[PDB]
Design a protein around this ligand. Sequence first.
Ligand SMILES: *[C@@H]1O[C@H](CO)[C@@H](O[C@@H]2O[C@H](CO)[C@@H](O[C@@H]3O[C@H](CO)[C@@H](O)[C@H](O[C@H]4O[C@H](CO)[C@@H](O)[C@H](O)[C@@H]4O[C@H]4O[C@H](CO)[C@@H](O)[C@H](O)[C@@H]4O)[C@@H]3O)[C@H](O)[C@H]2NC(C)=O)[C@H](O)[C@H]1NC(C)=O
Ligand SMILES: *[C@@H]1O[C@H](CO)[C@@H](O[C@@H]2O[C@H](CO)[C@@H](O)[C@H](O)[C@H]2NC(C)=O)[C@H](O)[C@H]1NC(C)=O
Ligand SMILES: *[C@@H]1O[C@H](CO)[C@@H](O[C@@H]2O[C@H](CO)[C@@H](O)[C@H](O)[C@H]2NC(C)=O)[C@H](O)[C@H]1NC(C)=O
Ligand SMILES: *[C@@H]1O[C@H](CO)[C@@H](O[C@@H]2O[C@H](CO)[C@@H](O)[C@H](O)[C@H]2NC(C)=O)[C@H](O)[C@H]1NC(C)=O
Ligand SMILES: *[C@@H]1O[C@H](CO)[C@@H](O[C@@H]2O[C@H](CO)[C@@H](O)[C@H](O)[C@H]2NC(C)=O)[C@H](O)[C@H]1NC(C)=O
Ligand SMILES: *[C@@H]1O[C@H](CO)[C@@H](O[C@@H]2O[C@H](CO)[C@@H](O)[C@H](O)[C@H]2NC(C)=O)[C@H](O)[C@H]1NC(C)=O
Ligand SMILES: *[C@@H]1O[C@H](CO)[C@@H](O[C@@H]2O[C@H](CO)[C@@H](O)[C@H](O)[C@H]2NC(C)=O)[C@H](O)[C@H]1NC(C)=O
Ligand SMILES: *[C@@H]1O[C@H](CO)[C@@H](O[C@@H]2O[C@H](CO)[C@@H](O)[C@H](O)[C@H]2NC(C)=O)[C@H](O)[C@H]1NC(C)=O
Ligand SMILES: *[C@@H]1O[C@H](CO)[C@@H](O[C@@H]2O[C@H](CO)[C@@H](O)[C@H](O)[C@H]2NC(C)=O)[C@H](O)[C@H]1NC(C)=O
Ligand SMILES: *[C@@H]1O[C@H](CO)[C@@H](O[C@@H]2O[C@H](CO)[C@@H](O)[C@H](O)[C@H]2NC(C)=O)[C@H](O)[C@H]1NC(C)=O
Ligand SMILES: *[C@@H]1O[C@H](CO)[C@@H](O[C@@H]2O[C@H](CO)[C@@H](O)[C@H](O)[C@H]2NC(C)=O)[C@H](O)[C@H]1NC(C)=O
Ligand SMILES: *[C@@H]1O[C@H](CO)[C@@H](O[C@@H]2O[C@H](CO)[C@@H](O)[C@H](O)[C@H]2NC(C)=O)[C@H](O)[C@H]1NC(C)=O
Ligand SMILES: *[C@@H]1O[C@H](CO)[C@@H](O[C@@H]2O[C@H](CO)[C@@H](O)[C@H](O)[C@H]2NC(C)=O)[C@H](O)[C@H]1NC(C)=O
Ligand SMILES: *[C@@H]1O[C@H](CO)[C@@H](O)[C@H](O)[C@H]1NC(C)=O
Ligand SMILES: *[C@@H]1O[C@H](CO)[C@@H](O)[C@H](O)[C@H]1NC(C)=O
Ligand SMILES: *[C@@H]1O[C@H](CO)[C@@H](O)[C@H](O)[C@H]1NC(C)=O
Ligand SMILES: *[C@@H]1O[C@H](CO)[C@@H](O)[C@H](O)[C@H]1NC(C)=O
Ligand SMILES: *[C@@H]1O[C@H](CO)[C@@H](O)[C@H](O)[C@H]1NC(C)=O
Ligand SMILES: *[C@@H]1O[C@H](CO)[C@@H](O)[C@H](O)[C@H]1NC(C)=O
Ligand SMILES: *[C@@H]1O[C@H](CO)[C@@H](O)[C@H](O)[C@H]1NC(C)=O
Lengths: 125, 125, 125, 441, 48, 48
Amino acid sequence: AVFLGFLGAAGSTMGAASMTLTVQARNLLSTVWGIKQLQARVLAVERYLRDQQLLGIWGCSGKLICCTNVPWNSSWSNRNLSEIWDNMTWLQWDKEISNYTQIIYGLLEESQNQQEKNEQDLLAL
Amino acid sequence: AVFLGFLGAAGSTMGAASMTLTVQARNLLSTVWGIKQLQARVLAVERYLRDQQLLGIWGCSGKLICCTNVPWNSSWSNRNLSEIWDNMTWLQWDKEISNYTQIIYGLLEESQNQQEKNEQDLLAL
Amino acid sequence: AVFLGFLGAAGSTMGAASMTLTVQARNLLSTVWGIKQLQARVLAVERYLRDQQLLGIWGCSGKLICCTNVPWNSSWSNRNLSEIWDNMTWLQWDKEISNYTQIIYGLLEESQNQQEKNEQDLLAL
Amino acid sequence: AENLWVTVYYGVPVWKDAETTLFCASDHNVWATHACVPTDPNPQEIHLENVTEEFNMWKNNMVEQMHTDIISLWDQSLKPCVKLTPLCVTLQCTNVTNNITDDMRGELKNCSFNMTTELRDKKQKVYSLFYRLDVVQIKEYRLINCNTSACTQACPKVSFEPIPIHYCAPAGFAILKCKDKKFNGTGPCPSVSTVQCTHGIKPVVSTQLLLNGSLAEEEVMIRSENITNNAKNILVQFNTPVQINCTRPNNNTRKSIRIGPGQAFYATGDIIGDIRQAHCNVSKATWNETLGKVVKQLRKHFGNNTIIRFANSSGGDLEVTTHSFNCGGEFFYCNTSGLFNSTWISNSNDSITLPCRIKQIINMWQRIGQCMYAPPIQGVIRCVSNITGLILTRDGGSTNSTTETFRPGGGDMRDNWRSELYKYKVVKIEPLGVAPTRCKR
Amino acid sequence: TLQCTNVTNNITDDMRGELKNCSFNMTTELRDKKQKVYSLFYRLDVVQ
Amino acid sequence: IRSENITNNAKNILVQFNTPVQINCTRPNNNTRKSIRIGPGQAFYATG
Ligand SMILES: *[C@@H]1O[C@H](CO)[C@@H](O[C@@H]2O[C@H](CO)[C@@H](O[C@@H]3O[C@H](CO)[C@@H](O)[C@H](O[C@H]4O[C@H](CO)[C@@H](O)[C@H](O)[C@@H]4O[C@H]4O[C@H](CO)[C@@H](O)[C@H](O)[C@@H]4O)[C@@H]3O)[C@H](O)[C@H]2NC(C)=O)[C@H](O)[C@H]1NC(C)=O
Ligand SMILES: *[C@@H]1O[C@H](CO)[C@@H](O[C@@H]2O[C@H](CO)[C@@H](O)[C@H](O)[C@H]2NC(C)=O)[C@H](O)[C@H]1NC(C)=O
Ligand SMILES: *[C@@H]1O[C@H](CO)[C@@H](O[C@@H]2O[C@H](CO)[C@@H](O)[C@H](O)[C@H]2NC(C)=O)[C@H](O)[C@H]1NC(C)=O
Ligand SMILES: *[C@@H]1O[C@H](CO)[C@@H](O[C@@H]2O[C@H](CO)[C@@H](O)[C@H](O)[C@H]2NC(C)=O)[C@H](O)[C@H]1NC(C)=O
Ligand SMILES: *[C@@H]1O[C@H](CO)[C@@H](O[C@@H]2O[C@H](CO)[C@@H](O)[C@H](O)[C@H]2NC(C)=O)[C@H](O)[C@H]1NC(C)=O
Ligand SMILES: *[C@@H]1O[C@H](CO)[C@@H](O[C@@H]2O[C@H](CO)[C@@H](O)[C@H](O)[C@H]2NC(C)=O)[C@H](O)[C@H]1NC(C)=O
Ligand SMILES: *[C@@H]1O[C@H](CO)[C@@H](O[C@@H]2O[C@H](CO)[C@@H](O)[C@H](O)[C@H]2NC(C)=O)[C@H](O)[C@H]1NC(C)=O
Ligand SMILES: *[C@@H]1O[C@H](CO)[C@@H](O[C@@H]2O[C@H](CO)[C@@H](O)[C@H](O)[C@H]2NC(C)=O)[C@H](O)[C@H]1NC(C)=O
Ligand SMILES: *[C@@H]1O[C@H](CO)[C@@H](O[C@@H]2O[C@H](CO)[C@@H](O)[C@H](O)[C@H]2NC(C)=O)[C@H](O)[C@H]1NC(C)=O
Ligand SMILES: *[C@@H]1O[C@H](CO)[C@@H](O[C@@H]2O[C@H](CO)[C@@H](O)[C@H](O)[C@H]2NC(C)=O)[C@H](O)[C@H]1NC(C)=O
Ligand SMILES: *[C@@H]1O[C@H](CO)[C@@H](O[C@@H]2O[C@H](CO)[C@@H](O)[C@H](O)[C@H]2NC(C)=O)[C@H](O)[C@H]1NC(C)=O
Ligand SMILES: *[C@@H]1O[C@H](CO)[C@@H](O[C@@H]2O[C@H](CO)[C@@H](O)[C@H](O)[C@H]2NC(C)=O)[C@H](O)[C@H]1NC(C)=O
Ligand SMILES: *[C@@H]1O[C@H](CO)[C@@H](O[C@@H]2O[C@H](CO)[C@@H](O)[C@H](O)[C@H]2NC(C)=O)[C@H](O)[C@H]1NC(C)=O
Ligand SMILES: *[C@@H]1O[C@H](CO)[C@@H](O)[C@H](O)[C@H]1NC(C)=O
Ligand SMILES: *[C@@H]1O[C@H](CO)[C@@H](O)[C@H](O)[C@H]1NC(C)=O
Ligand SMILES: *[C@@H]1O[C@H](CO)[C@@H](O)[C@H](O)[C@H]1NC(C)=O
Ligand SMILES: *[C@@H]1O[C@H](CO)[C@@H](O)[C@H](O)[C@H]1NC(C)=O
Ligand SMILES: *[C@@H]1O[C@H](CO)[C@@H](O)[C@H](O)[C@H]1NC(C)=O
Ligand SMILES: *[C@@H]1O[C@H](CO)[C@@H](O)[C@H](O)[C@H]1NC(C)=O
Ligand SMILES: *[C@@H]1O[C@H](CO)[C@@H](O)[C@H](O)[C@H]1NC(C)=O
């Protein structure tokens, strides 16, 4: 069996699944039938570029695990780390939190520019 | 009205326009009619990749406001910061300095490699 | 003559050839005939994205000369730097060591994640 | 106290349901493998441990994609072939009375007609043999398709033999396969795996019987979207196949008539020897055992003490009323009346013979205005096939009567494709994720 | 080759000669047979 | 009133109104259509 590989860590906990992000990251990129294949490749490239742009805008460019300055609001979730990182799966967490997605993205986006401005001001001196 | 948003800061000064780079940054990526749509889509990805490569080569990868080492030559422009960052628009500055574009690009390109070489030399010790 | 430019440093030594990586870096991106041109452009974009992803996974994102933590095994090559960086060309080295490519890539990939984890642990304190 | 901060993870193993376009993977034919990618000699599959996924075979877009692709390939294959437009002429036909039996009297007509030639100002008188199902009286007859649309002739070089084809999803997507036996195509499958491409699926076109299909690994399986409702078909999958031997024993002869510059029409010159009906044979004991297993399984859903009846088809077009298939280019339509004829009550070497007919003007898909004239095949033909499933329909079903009557079904080709892709689904990955974590930037 | 005649069935002064009643032979489903048919055409569509 | 070069007569003048003007067009003849089969699956529609 090939239990471990690519998506094999889907059923494991978030802590255990956090050690195998690279296997998922690698595969995201790779007459009538050729047209369909080209369309699919174009869509895949667009999706990959969208994901890369979203990662870069938040300042975590070229990083798989990147914790940031935005604090966690208790309203979005109340469970503690004890019952999350070793007592839950990534799919369950995404299902629970899928409603609260865009607000954190906006918070990261507006937080990155302040850090950039402060760095520029510090380097001005 | 939706005065503020995307290109709403076009008429504002450079200092005020520099606070909203992200809203312009986001939108750069996103039977006979389908062919035209695909042809149009093919070009946007190429333009975005060209811009990203040009930014990365200078060493400002993953940064919206990145200062560099090349000094400013007084010949290209004589106006001081007092009448630029709060008494001029980005369009006017680009129109004024559209002639002298490539030289600074080359200077940045040649300057980045020296910093890389020096960093390698220091880390060698 | 245009002896220097793009691939002009192909016949030079590795030490001399390493000074002009940017010229090669720039050019990697840029009715029946249009279909062939579009196919070629799609393949070129895919190849460029693959190369960029492979560079990014190893932690050398946005760098032309980036050293890493994986040590060099003497079994793969026994020649010293004295007879390599000024007594050999890049083509000869690539021909010699074309066999042992993937193992170093895997070592780099597995080494990057440990550094990221250690950085997260240090910042946790 | 908690002092947590948001953190972004790239490459989280999370997937969502989605629809996309799949492409080829395969090892002169109608199912063009020229434009299909080669298959890897060593396919890879990754079993997902402790992962249960919802499945529903009746909402699969893969079936629609397969149907559309098959129709497109069929249309493409016939593009570079001769069009039989001049054939719409007044025929003069007589009955064939040369060594025929008591059942094939009037089944063949010897027709004569004028036709064009390579030269624009010349005509030639020719003759041919036609089937009674192809000619309609206007001692004067015409082709049935003349008043509907002018239609073409299948090129003789291409072959109708099915070839296995694998479907592969693009990058950023995945195909989930349910390895749980006894899974009935709807519900939560607990045993799941990820596969880059599907297994070889033969696009076999047949009605009233699934031929050269896949066999259940445990026992006879019964599937239906809503078993209580009689308007939905029932798919029965066998755990063992049944051998069926079909044959046309007539020794046909082919001749070519030049109807224009570089245009030839292939006609049936004459039949050598005796003329007899084509027929199929099915083992009797094996069929009885299979029907016993089928009724045993059906008793689970439709009561334990009910009477289970197998009868004949209700009616309709010849394609839906009769088991329709094709062997070696010849299109057989056969009368499966001796098989589905019995009653079951709760409590040697003879073979069932189906005599049956052949057709040349074919409307394969449920479309009007396009034919496919099959050129005749030279010599006697025979083949052997595996019956591995059935499509059944419940007649009536009101509470007034406790006896259940099941009849043959078919017609729609989507049922044939649904029998192979019932355990497959497609999802798209969502690598980005956000979580809480102690460290701060 | 169409054979046309003037229509003189309940027309006004301004619509005299505007419509032509034309008969002609035509093909059919069978390439052997032919059929005689007729129709009405506009003066701007038919030239002598 | 819009024009590329109002002085030159060779350029058209585009006039855009402020309020629209209603125009009612009508053909009062009671036409009848008949189909003639000119071939296999080919029909020509004529004014009977
Ligand atoms: C279920 O599966 C079974 C087995 O997998 C299928 O049964 C097989 O069917 C195939 C096709 O009918 C058959 O292969 C033929 O065998 C014939 C006898 O040996 C061959 O003569 C024939 O070759 C001719 O056709 C080819 C194209 O298919 C040509 O490439 C070839 O040159 C031959 O054509 C010449 O001869 C003809 C006739 O004289 C002439 O008109 C041509 O111009 C040309 O000169 C095929 O190889 C297998 O033998 C069958 N297998 C068994 C065990 O019997 C069955 O059909 C499947 N069921 C369904 C519904 O598809
Ligand atoms: C179909 O009809 C044709 C024409 O009548 C038959 O061909 C004739 O066969 C006889 C002998 O059987 C010859 O004497 C004639 O010369 C043939 N006619 C032509 C035009 O060649 C043909 O045999 C008939 N076929 C069958 C099966 O009855
Ligand atoms: C082939 O064409 C010939 C004539 O071109 C047909 O013979 C004619 O048949 C008609 C009957 O409708 C007679 O009125 C003519 O006098 C015949 N002419 C000649 C020269 O024989 C012949 O019947 C056609 N073939 C078939 C099978 O119908
Ligand atoms: C399966 O089919 C039955 C029969 O149609 C469905 O039950 C019917 O539902 C309709 C919905 O309005 C009612 O009007 C009928 O009175 C019902 N009849 C019976 C006998 O129950 C049933 O809902 C279908 N199954 C599902 C899951 O929808
Ligand atoms: C189907 O079965 C029938 C008998 O039920 C077979 O008919 C026999 O065929 C053989 C051929 O070798 C002859 O020798 C016998 O004389 C035939 N007997 C009868 C009664 O017809 C038939 O051949 C079988 N066909 C197939 C394809 O299996
Ligand atoms: C269908 O055809 C196959 C092969 O022609 C038959 O299998 C043969 O059966 C005879 C009679 O028992 C044996 O002598 C042969 O050895 C068998 N051959 C093979 C390859 O198995 C089969 O019996 C036929 N089925 C029917 C219902 O007639
Ligand atoms: C299934 O069996 C019935 C009963 O024999 C068939 O009904 C016969 O149909 C034919 C027409 O082809 C009539 O001449 C007979 O009189 C009918 N039988 C009776 C008893 O009336 C029916 O045709 C069979 N199914 C198919 C598809 O043929
Ligand atoms: C399918 O086969 C059955 C069984 O032979 C046919 O039923 C017979 O039909 C004929 C009419 O051609 C009747 O004379 C017989 O009495 C019927 N037999 C029985 C047992 O009912 C049936 O007609 C066939 N299907 C078709 C479409 O012909
Ligand atoms: C009909 O079914 C039999 C039994 O499943 C098939 O014979 C098997 O063929 C496979 C080939 O993939 C072999 O691995 C098995 O060992 C065979 N089993 C037996 C008992 O012989 C047969 O190939 C099928 N016929 C067709 C035409 O598909
Ligand atoms: C156009 O001409 C045709 C043919 O002359 C007219 O149809 C004829 O009408 C008369 C009386 O209405 C009938 O007695 C004939 O039998 C018709 N001929 C045919 C071939 O059907 C038609 O009425 C004329 N139309 C107009 C508007 O004048
Ligand atoms: C339709 O075709 C017929 C037959 O060709 C035409 O009638 C012929 O007309 C020519 C020229 O006027 C005469 O030489 C023939 O003697 C006619 N033959 C017959 C049998 O009438 C007829 O005129 C054609 N229709 C139209 C509207 O032109
Ligand atoms: C608008 O049209 C007028 C008339 O052509 C242009 O004026 C003419 O320009 C040509 C250019 O060689 C002279 O030869 C004529 O003598 C001029 N005629 C007059 C009456 O001036 C005028 O230039 C056009 N407008 C613009 C903006 O080009
Ligand atoms: C256009 O105007 C004319 C009058 O100038 C209208 O003609 C009248 O139409 C009505 C229709 O209901 C008749 O009752 C009158 O007898 C007609 N009178 C005259 C003098 O022709 C005509 O109807 C108008 N058409 C439209 C579409 O408005
Ligand atoms: C041909 O035979 C059939 C069946 O016996 C009969 O109905 C038909 O009238 C015959 N036609 C002839 C002799 O032209
Ligand atoms: C063609 O003729 C058959 C039988 O004469 C008839 O059933 C069919 O409806 C006709 N086709 C059309 C398009 O009317
Ligand atoms: C069989 O199908 C029905 C359809 O509703 C479903 O409820 C049931 O769970 C299925 N059987 C199994 C074992 O999953
Ligand atoms: C069919 O006829 C041809 C020509 O006479 C002959 O060669 C062939 O053997 C015949 N086929 C059979 C099965 O008898
Ligand atoms: C159907 O089965 C009955 C048994 O009751 C039998 O008498 C009859 O002949 C069968 N019909 C056919 C067509 O085999
Ligand atoms: C039809 O009427 C027009 C106009 O009155 C006339 O010019 C033409 O000659 C007429 N044609 C005839 C009577 O054939
Ligand atoms: C046109 O003629 C038809 C057929 O007589 C009739 O039903 C219809 O009412 C007529 N139209 C008008 C506007 O009178």
